Amino acid sequence: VNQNAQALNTLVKQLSSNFGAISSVLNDILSRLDPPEAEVQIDRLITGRL
Amino acid sequence: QIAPGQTGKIADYNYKLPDDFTGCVIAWNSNNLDNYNYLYRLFRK
Numbered sequence: 001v002n003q004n005a006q007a008l009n010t011l012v013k014q015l016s017s018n019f020g021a022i023s024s025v026l027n028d029i030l031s032r033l034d035p036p037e038a039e040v041q042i043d044r045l046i047t048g049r050l
Numbered sequence: 051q052i053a054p055g056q057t058g059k060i061a062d063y064n065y066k067l068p069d070d071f072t073g074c075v076i077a078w079n080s081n082n083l084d085n086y087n088y089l090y091r092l093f094r095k
Contacts, residue, residue, distance in 0.1 A: 036055030036069050 019048025052077070063094040 016024045021044040023029055029041045051061040055069035 034055070034057060039069070 015049070017048065019044045021045045021048075059092065060090065064091045 018024050021029060021041045022032070024045070026042070026045065029038050029045070032038075033041060051058040052065075052067065052075050054067045054071040056067070061067070
């Protein structure tokens with residue numbers, strides 16, 4: 001029970017990690033940057049989450 | 051401003067290139083060849 005619940009906690013905690021993007025929040029990257037540069041930041045959160 | 055995925059008065063309201071434009075951009079001066087006929091747009095909805 002502990003190992004499944006610690007694994008599911010680490011999995012959600014990893015949304016809020018930056019992976020070298022300029023924010024962990026996908027709405028910061030969307031609202032702050034324009035599409036030419038925002039996509040190159042989003043691919044860091046995609047490849048991190050993935 | 052004439053490159054894929056850029057912003058400014060021309061590249062937003064007047065003529066825009068996709069972030070996945072496949073191709074090349076070329077320009078040369080025409081001061082000695084071409085004045086007010088050259089219209090461009092300031093604003094858009």
